[PDB]
């Protein structure tokens with residue numbers, strides 16, 4: 001994931 | 005119900021409601037914000053909505069708009085959508101949720117009430133997406149029910165593109181045609197009973213999200229709905  | 009409106013440009017925003025990061029700028033609807041130097045602000049979402057609610061029982065509609073995607077890199081994110089949802093629908097999560105979903109429920113169709121045509125610039129790893137930029141029809145999930153390749157030439161063209169979105173309330177079919185001037189054309193259709201999903205009032209509008217290196221602008225918008233009886 002690209003989250004953060 | 006019967007509703008009609010017409011914005012040949014956004015030198016007027018008389019009936020438009022702005023939420024989250026969206027604002028009127030350069031005689032367009034700017035869906036996500038830019039800083040004082042014009043740089044896209046990361047991790048923001050915005051909605052620009054027609055302020056008055058309407059109903060979808062025994063109704064067909066046609067809407068058309070023009071739009072531009074401005075990118076500042078080869079890795080823009082995340083895109084935008086035209087959506088229908090209840091009138092209290094807020095701006096939801098930024099990034100790949102497109103301002104339309106919450107992370108804890110984004111692929112749970114029972115937990116959402118939103119239908120959209122999305123223009124997706126970033127292939128998300130977090131849920132099933134095609135491995136290319138795409139245009140899709142979303143029904144209660146960020147995982148599109150109907151999806152087609154959006155050519156990178158058109159994505160990065162900086163052209164003023166057109167979308168036509170119609171709903172035939174007899175056949176229960178939602179269709180989008182997307183056209184680029186001297187570029188691609190795109191056609192997607194899906195059978196979906198909107199009056200079943202939305203037995204009450206709804207509003208229509210646009211949602212954009214970052215992401216990074218991208219701003220989405222709506223340049224014109226018209227709409228008409230009519231009874232099927």
Ligand SMILES: *[C@H]1O[C@H](CO)[C@H](O)[C@H](O)[C@H]1NC(C)=O
Nearest residue numbers: 002003081099100101130215
């Ligand atoms: C993570 O960040 C990328 C950009 O680096 C995209 O905005 C992507 O959509 C993000 N992932 C999620 C789940 O929002």
Ligand SMILES: [Ca+2]
Nearest residue numbers: 124133140148
């Ligand atoms: Ca998508």
Ligand SMILES: [Ca+2]
Nearest residue numbers: 100124126128
């Ligand atoms: Ca995506």
